[PDB]
Design a protein around this ligand. Structure first.
Ligand SMILES: [Zn+2]
Ligand SMILES: [Zn+2]
Lengths: 203, 22, 275, 55, 299, 53, 248, 299, 19
């Protein structure tokens, strides 16, 4: 119930991201956009808009945001870092945003376990029966892809904020060690990464 | 692919959320 | 979200008939158009486009313009884009379209007699008084409101026949433009780009020759002379299976379009008016 | 705190004089209209305006 | 203590005759989707906001009405809502557990965590929507004398009439469970009563008769009868336990008007320690109150 | 409004010009549109109006 | 407490609009009887002042207005202050409130229109219009010399005659805005401009020049100060009488 | 004690917001190559040498500014540098260990051997550059009475606000570690505090809470509180231990103004042995000081 | 519509496609 209200808030945030996507007005789904390398401008615009959206959420009182940014869509393995598909380097005063399009495409193309898993849900058969007697859309897979991209750009934006607030040195050190944001919220609340946890165990 | 060692604890830290006392 | 999709204010008053109204989203754009892209394409063979004029730093004059959807073989009625009130009934197969659409066209062309005839015919529908009259009222009111909005006389120096070299004399295309309704005149202004644009004694030429023609028959995707301009355009099957897995590709493409280029726009001392 | 769902459909005033409004944006005015104006009847004037003007 | 407040009736609901308490109109967000349909009646105090009224009336899903009631009793609130929407019957009382609306109106009348509505068992004991009457055995139905006895044997006939019409029978006598059980056994009432108040009881003569008085809350900021001036909350909770989540009206019949916590009707009887032919008149009073409720909702 | 009811298009146009050459144009639009809509609706000497029986 | 002509416009009616568009300088009890907003929006002028010199330690902030008329305006668009014969024409009497129309009629001596508007507005409106009359007439009388320094606008007298034809408030406005090219300081004539920046004529005050085109007046040397580009108003020859450094 | 001194901001640095103390401008030789880049701020007292000023201005790698401050406190020095270069935040304080510049300005504020900059861990607890506040538990947050209690339960809300905005929470109460730990446990503050001051502590109820007071230096030629008038050095050292090598400003809140060693702001509270609703006003004062710092660096 | 000015001049004739 309460948890359902927070779920509704999270889905509303996703819907706001959807409004941002519609504002961008892309003909293709983000999966196809990323699959299409020629759509470099579309990819850059998507990333920039997502970053601005996350910035507005993280700083509700702040509406300003860097209105120009150098962008480079990378494809080669040597042009990407595992665990950081998006990077923010500086070419001596020029702010470069590197994108690992192949990694984005791979993540999006991964099959999701929508049907496979069974999870608790409102399953009152009495209500269903009572209803039966009284008698442009987004799929679960698309929502999952869209959440994945939003969280990826959230990680990227956190690294970017470290870069801007502290500097390139601390940005690199954060890339090396991510322990800075185990606390996270300490602004952050509007970031989905602060809503759940994920862990890895030896097995 | 990169043959680079992976830091499991750092990935956990990436997706680690501290819980307050209220 | 004002839907200015004229020709989407069509209701299949017949119960057995359902009007999909699958028309373009841009109707919700508060632009100078009063008819959105898909209606334009279907009923006038035009595709909406925009022509930037000054686009250097923030001066972003973007004159609108539509494109021919008429090949280089069509002629007469087939080539007429916006027929005159004298011939629109013939150019359009009104009998093949829904009576509500016929009413919309008759209102646009001020064919009040046809409007009266259509409502008289609807008088004899089974559910006439129940909902046919309601549909009539809704469609008629929407169309009348749109027409009044378009008409400037309700509650500038663009000449369309003044470009035509080699013409004997007369022009009069602007005469027929005046004879047109406010909605039709605004449509022509919105879709047709004057070949010349003079600002405070500063003339810009966009084409070396106008592409459209205006005469008594109306607006025609014809040429001032010579032949017509070239204007080209899952259910898995056995053929859909491709064979074994295994030339200016590196250069951009110039559109093979025929935008509506015709007329001269004169602007007085007013500077680069961007409001 | 704020609550809203979507645009709503409501009643229609059918008396002509309901459209009477002060030409002033800075000075509000409200015409006196009888609720009868909200009946889908032939009457295109509300009882108030009818009595006031046509007796 | 006259307090203004708003009530809304859902124009299309799944669960009927159910009321939900909200601290303010904005609480509907906590229900979101497929939860409001289970509360066709919404009650919340009014903050004198005309813009709030405009929002509510714009909420075409609800029919709104405003009424005032003292801020100390569900009785007036329920009378006002029931007369507003011509509903003689009330379903289980629900509250927004996530955001408990602290209205002094309630103060131990009844409630439920809203989310438990769907779990409610519609099936009950009596067809229709029966009334409820609670009797304080001690000197009310029996004689206060040590050798207790039915003050008027017409008690049996009155109870049978109650059952025949359809009305849940409840006992609450502030005595020992053993005392009340043996009083029932001696006066041969026993099976007459649906509910008994004074692991329920085990003596090898009774299986389960006195629901253990597990619920303890002391008082709600009111100095009165040490235990309590009776508990509409407890009695309605036991009704639900007995699968009675609906009722028409509730009447407390006892020998002590002091208790009278909050009941749709009340009847007082003499603290008579000896048999006397008066329970027929008391039964006349009770049926008169029932008929008065029937008149309130005769239309 | 009364001018519209009794035609008097000359006075109607005079009023519109006065209200235009001074927001006020928006009120012109609202009042004239509503009055003309009702007038055309009545308009017994036409069709598409649901008046003539 | 402030002072602004046309700020006396009380909501006599319920017709068109009113929001008190008065610049804060109305509180500045200067020699003007009109504030910046009204001056700008009714005469295409901006209030300004000008010091002179510290030779005798005078440095008086000489009152002067700034042209708000470019070099492309002609006729009416170039007329700054209209005469009684053309104020009605230049001013959109149909746009401003009847209160301001009454103010113009009074200041230009159009009592016929004043009474016409009063009678029309009678059908609390009458008393509010009477309050407007009180305020406007008080201002006019205050400006009027007729009650209990040879500022020639022609010598550098037809021009002085036209200025006199103007009302007390209008004459005050003209003398406050315009600045003589020549000023005598009691037997020492000083020239401050070699040319004029405005002309007084039958139509009234015009942002014109004696000859040639109109003065241009539109709407990395960071290490140096700036000189204003706008054109202040300049016309006439004023003579200060036998008075001392009258810094009073 | 007004002393003239020079400060230099590196025009292109690797490590930001870090200051290094030099006994004189010539000390840069001790850094030589690839060490100056790790100290973008350099502070050294001025010897009134115009030729030295000429050399410095010729050193185009640095932007120079001269200011005066009393020779007894880092507070004025840091205010002057931060206003000169519009830097609200300060990094870990570094000194040239090879040639310790003996400035009386420092006298137990903070420092670091310069070479340890690179070893510093940039990652910290709170995003951005949080403020720091140190609280003297005894009678400041609790009641001096034996049965200590929060003088104003609004303490919890104030601490939560501090955390929400972002500000390190530190306690230093001059009592036994056990006393302070049990006070935390009783008043249920505990997890509120990032740092606690009074092998850290082991009682089977706490893992590590009171960093052992290993650092002992007696006094720096100043007769005052026997232990110390509090220690900016120790508290900032513990901040670094907690990975906090940056801060915006530091405020000492206690019941004793005598301690007040050197803190960007100070707040005094009553030595009240009994609960009283005043900590809301004290919190107002603290947030006012924070806002004042925000105003100093609002641009 | 692009504002570019392509090069159009003269007459061209071809038999078959030759492409
Ligand atoms: Zn009315
Ligand atoms: Zn003013």
């Amino acid at each position: 119930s309460l948890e359902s209200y927070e779920t509704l808030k999270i889905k509303l945030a996703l819907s706001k991201y959807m409004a941002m996507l519609s504002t961008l007005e892309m003909t293709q789904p983000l999966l196809e956009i990323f699959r299409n390398k020629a759509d470099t401008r579309q990819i850059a615009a998507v990333v920039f808009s997502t970053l601005a959206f996350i910035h507005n959420r993280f700083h509700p009182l702040v509406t300003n945001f860097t209105n120009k940014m150098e962008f480079v869509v990378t494809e080669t393995n040597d042009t990407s870092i595992p665990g950081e598909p998006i990077l923010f380097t500086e070419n001596e005063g020029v702010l470069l945003c590197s994108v690992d399009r192949p990694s984005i495409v791979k993540m999006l193309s991964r099959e999701f376990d929508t049907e496979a898993l069974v999870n608790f849900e409102n399953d009152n058969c009495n209500v269903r029966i009572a209803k039966t007697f009284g008698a442009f859309s987004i799929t679960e897979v698309e929502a999952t892809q869209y959440l994945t991209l939003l969280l990826t750009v959230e990680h990227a934006y956190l690294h970017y904020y470290i870069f801007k607030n502290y500097g390139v040195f601390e940005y690199c050190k954060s890339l090396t060690d991510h322990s800075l944001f185990t606390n996270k919220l300490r602004k952050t609340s509007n970031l989905l990464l602060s809503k759940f946890k994920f862990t890895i165990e030896d097995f | 692919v990169s043959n680079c060692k992976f830091n499991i604890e750092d990935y956990n830290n990436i997706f680690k959320v501290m819980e307050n006392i209220r | 979200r004002v839907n200015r999709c004229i020709f989407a204010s069509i209701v299949s008053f017949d119960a057995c008939i359902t009007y999909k109204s699958p028309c373009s989203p841009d109707a919700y754009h508060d632009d100078g158009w009063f008819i959105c892209n898909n209606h334009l394409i279907k009923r006038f063979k035009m595709s909406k486009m925009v022509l930037p004029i000054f686009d250097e730093d923030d001066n972003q004059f973007k004159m609108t313009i539509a494109r021919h959807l008429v090949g280089n073989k069509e002629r007469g009625i087939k080539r007429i884009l916006i027929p005159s009130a004298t011939n629109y009934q013939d150019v359009f197969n009104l009998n093949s379209m829904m009576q509500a659409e016929q009413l919309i066209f008759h209102l646009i062309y001020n064919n009040e007699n046809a409007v009266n005839t259509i409502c008289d015919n609807l008088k004899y529908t089974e559910g006439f008084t129940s909902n046919t009259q309601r549909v009539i009222h809704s469609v008629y009111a929407t169309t009348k409101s749109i027409l009044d909005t378009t008409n400037p006389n309700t509650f500038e120096l663009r000449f369309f026949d003044v470009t035509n070299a080699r013409a004997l004399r007369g022009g009069a295309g602007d005469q027929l433009f005046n004879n047109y309704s406010g909605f039709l005149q605004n449509l022509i202004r919105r879709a047709v780009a004057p070949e010349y644009l003079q600002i405070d004694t500063e003339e810009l030429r966009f084409r070396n020759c106008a592409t459209c023609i205006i005469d008594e028959t109306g607006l025609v995707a014809s040429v001032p002379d010579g032949p017509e301009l070239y204007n080209p355009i899952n259910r898995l099957q056995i053929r859909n299976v491709l064979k074994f897995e295994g030339t200016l590709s590196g250069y951009e493409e110039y559109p093979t379009y025929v935008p509506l280029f015709l007329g001269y726009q004169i602007i007085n001392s007013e500077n680069n008016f961007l409001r | 705190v704020p609550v809203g769902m979507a645009p709503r459909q409501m009643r229609v005033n059918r008396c002509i004089f309901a459209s009477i409004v002060s030409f002033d944006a800075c000075i509000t005015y409200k015409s006196p209209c009888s609720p009868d104006a909200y009946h889908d009847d032939g009457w295109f004037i509300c009882n108030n305006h009818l009595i006031k003007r046509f007796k | 203590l006259q307090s203004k407040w708003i009530c809304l009736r859902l124009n299309d609901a799944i669960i009927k005759r159910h009321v939900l308490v909200l601290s303010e109109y904005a609480d509907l967000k906590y229900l979101g989707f497929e939860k409001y349909k289970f509360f066709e009646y919404v009650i919340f105090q009014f903050c004198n906001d005309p813009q709030l009224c405009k929002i509510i009336e714009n909420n075409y899903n609800y029919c709104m009405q405003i009424f005032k009631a003292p801020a100390d009793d569900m009785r007036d609130i329920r009378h006002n809502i029931k007369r507003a929407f011509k509903t003689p019957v009330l379903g289980h009382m629900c509250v927004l557990s996530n955001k408990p609306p602290m209205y002094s109106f309630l103060k131990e009348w009844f409630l439920l965590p809203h989310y438990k509505v769907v779990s409610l068992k519609s099936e009950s004991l009596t067809w229709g929507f029966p009334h409820v009457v609670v009797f304080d055995l001690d000197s009310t139905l029996i004689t206060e004398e040590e050798q207790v006895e039915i003050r008027d044997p017409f008690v049996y006939d009155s109870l049978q009439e109650l059952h025949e019409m359809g009305c849940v029978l409840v006992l609450w006598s502030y005595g020992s469970r053993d005392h009340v059980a043996h009083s029932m056994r001696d006066v041969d009432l026993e099976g007459y009563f649906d509910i008994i108040i004074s692991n329920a009881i085990v003596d090898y003569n009774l299986k389960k008769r006195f629901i253990e008085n597990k619920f303890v809350f002391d008082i709600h900021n009111h100095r009165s009868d040490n235990n309590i001036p009776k508990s509409p909350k407890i009695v309605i909770k036991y009704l639900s336990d007995k699968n009675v989540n609906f009722f028409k009206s509730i009447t407390l019949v006892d020998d002590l008007p002091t208790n009278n916590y909050a009941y749709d009707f009340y009847v007082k009887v003499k603290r008579c320690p000896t048999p006397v032919q008066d329970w027929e008149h008391y039964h006349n009073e009770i049926i008169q109150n029932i008929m008065d409720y029937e008149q309130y909702f005769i239309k | 409004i009364f001018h519209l009811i009794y035609n008097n298009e000359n006075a109607v146009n005079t009023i519109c010009d006065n209200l235009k050459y001074t927001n006020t144009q928006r009120v012109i639009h609202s009042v004239y549109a509503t009055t003309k809509s009702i007038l055309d609706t009545t308009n017994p000497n036409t069709f598409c109006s649901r008046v003539s029986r």
